[PDB]
Amino acid sequence: VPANLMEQIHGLETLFTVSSEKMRSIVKHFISELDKGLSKKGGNIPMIPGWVVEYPTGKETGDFLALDLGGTNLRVVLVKLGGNHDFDTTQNKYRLPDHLRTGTSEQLWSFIAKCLKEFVDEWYPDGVSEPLPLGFTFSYPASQKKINSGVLQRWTKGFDIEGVEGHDVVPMLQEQIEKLNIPINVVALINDTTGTLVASLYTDPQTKMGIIIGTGVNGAYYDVVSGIEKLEGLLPEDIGPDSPMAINCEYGSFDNEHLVLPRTKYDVIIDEESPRPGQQAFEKMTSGYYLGEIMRLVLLDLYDSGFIFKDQDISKLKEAYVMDTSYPSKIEDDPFENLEDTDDLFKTNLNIETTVVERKLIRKLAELVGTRAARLTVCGVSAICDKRGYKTAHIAADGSVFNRYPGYKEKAAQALKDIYNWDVEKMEDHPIQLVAAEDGSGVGAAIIACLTQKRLAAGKSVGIKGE
């Protein structure tokens, strides 16, 4: 590598390296923001009560349903809990008819009830011993004052179904179920990350957090009612001050004030050019969705400063979001020093021929961007653990970045070791460690339906007093 590109590589390292000291300072601020979101005044982190007020014991048994409404497919899941932190599952995916996304409320709920009937008649052709409790993962902006409710705030993902916004979807679905005489009760409506937490806690009793690291980012954990100022004066007597309370953090909005995250000029460009400038600061700094875009902007800056691709037509590189997450992924997986996979990637998809030294810079840039994202993500993990005093923990993780991004598990484990300065040799022995989660939107909704029914059947509250 010439002196010129070496100097530029040192510049990249200065841009993107996050020190252990910086991570610790981010964590302290993150803790303050978690506390702020639970306060009466609130803050940028929503810290949404999830209305799960008990831990699964792992001894639960029985048959429970989950529903998840996608943009393309409805997923219906049957979960049979085995009573020893174990379960069996089966599922069907039903393609949404083309018209449904822009149709009516009646059409939506009638379609979903018809699929549930088909599913129940397949698996229980002779009927059921008692009605099947159902948890509904409803992945649209919604709020709830009790778990067996969800008021749609606004449709997203190309949906525009008339007569649903501002209404509680749970009775809408239940009415269609009852019209078809299907033995189901819809007892819970959840965010998928809450499901990731609860399903993983049922199978792994050391789970302290559910975390999604993908296109979107989120984390869920259990707090305690006495630590939630914003619920003071709103709770019934049977949700007491020592009660657990699952929290869906929605922490992608952490540090919208831009006080601690180490944003570069490239991150500022991404934010300025995004659909919502000034929003989702932590998501923009940690989501896989932006990793290729960060690289694209750095490479354009290097080109404009005269350092790289000097005799190339870089037209294709000028298109925002042309480099998705597969770019840094394939680049980091490239096995040999001459970076042949990177060469093919640039030539084939961008029409850019590169030198080996240029590919070395691109590889270092990919490593820096993947590593920064992992190090910032684990600041959320450390903040939850430190807030709650978890000295050891399993952090149940899911999402395309955790599952597929090269070396992510090693990057995250090293980040936690750096934060805590642990004297520990093996990754498997780290006091706080990421482990693969159970299925939150299916299995987790079904398990939350089980926990909810325990309280419902006893006449115990699962929401605000009077709701």
UniProtKB/Swiss-Prot annotation:
InterPro entries for this protein: ATPase_NBD (IPR043129), Hexokinase (IPR001312), Hexokinase_BS (IPR019807), Hexokinase_C (IPR022673), Hexokinase_N (IPR022672)
Pathway where it operates: Carbohydrate metabolism; hexose metabolism; Carbohydrate degradation; glycolysis; D-glyceraldehyde 3-phosphate and glycerone phosphate from D-glucose: step 1/4
EC number: 2.7.1.1
Short name of any one Pfam family annotated for the protein: Hexokinase_1
GO biological process: glucose metabolic process; glycolytic process; intracellular glucose homeostasis; mannose metabolic process
Chain positions recorded as ATP binding sites: K93
Keyword entries, A-Z: Allosteric enzyme, ATP-binding, Glycolysis, Kinase, Nucleotide-binding, Phosphoprotein, Transferase
Chain spans, region Hexokinase large subdomain: 191-439
Record's catalysed reaction(s): a D-hexose + ATP = a D-hexose 6-phosphate + ADP + H(+); D-fructose + ATP = D-fructose 6-phosphate + ADP + H(+); D-glucose + ATP = D-glucose 6-phosphate + ADP + H(+)
Residue span of region Hexokinase small subdomain: 57-190
Sequence segments annotated as region (Glucose-binding): 133-159
Domain Hexokinase: 3-450
Top-level taxon in the UniProt lineage: Eukaryota
GO MF annotations in UniProt: ATP binding; D-glucose binding; fructokinase activity; glucokinase activity; mannokinase activity
Enzyme class: transferase
Entry's Gene Ontology cellular component terms: cytosol; mitochondrion
Family under the similarity heading: Belongs to the hexokinase family.
Role, per record: Catalyzes the phosphorylation of hexose, such as D-glucose and D-fructose, to hexose 6-phosphate (D-glucose 6-phosphate and D-fructose 6-phosphate, respectively). Has higher affinity for D-glucose. Mediates the initial step of glycolysis by catalyzing phosphorylation of D-glucose to D-glucose 6-phosphate.
Record's subunit section: Monomer and homodimer. The monomeric form is active, the homodimeric form inactive.
Protein name: Hexokinase
Organism, as annotated: Kluyveromyces lactis (strain ATCC 8585 / CBS 2359 / DSM 70799 / NBRC 1267 / NRRL Y-1140 / WM37)
Originating gene: RAG5
